[PDB]
Amino acid sequence: YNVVNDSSDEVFHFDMYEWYIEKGWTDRILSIDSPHVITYLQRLAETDFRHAELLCRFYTTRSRFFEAAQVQTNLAKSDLNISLKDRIILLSRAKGNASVNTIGISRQQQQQLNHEASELLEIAHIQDDLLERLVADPRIPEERKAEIEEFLDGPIRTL
């Protein structure tokens, strides 16, 4: 592992960040002082959920809660393939992270994000309560249930 960390090959270190992510070694990746890994995540954060989650962990441990709430909220409003329940977790985290002070950011900007995440989380829970009840309902034909699961187990719908 010395030979690994003693390298200056950049495509290599990118390939190793991806490999650590694959194997699940949050142990070793979260323990890198470097910003090089943060910058690498900032480009692909809004591309994949698993990468965004890593980026948000780096922000939170650095008391940058508002920036994580921003990543999580945009991810919940996006058209990436994300389940409704995963979008409930993202909003719930963003709601908490925007409710606490982050230095350098105005109280107004925090509250406006904490409010957008609170409303979207309220709608998401309604949608989750619906989807669950509809799937379990004995009086609903199977043919329709599959159709319900397609349109409700994804991005959050209007009221």
């Binding site: 609903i140 034909p141 043919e143 159709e147 009221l159």
Partner: peptide, 17 residues
């Protein structure tokens, strides 16, 4: 923003196509 429209929906109790 909510807008009720009972007019044209999709029969929740009938399959598609």
């Amino acid at each position: 923003k909510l807008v009720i429209n009972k007019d044209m929906r999709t029969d929740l109790f009938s399959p598609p196509n």
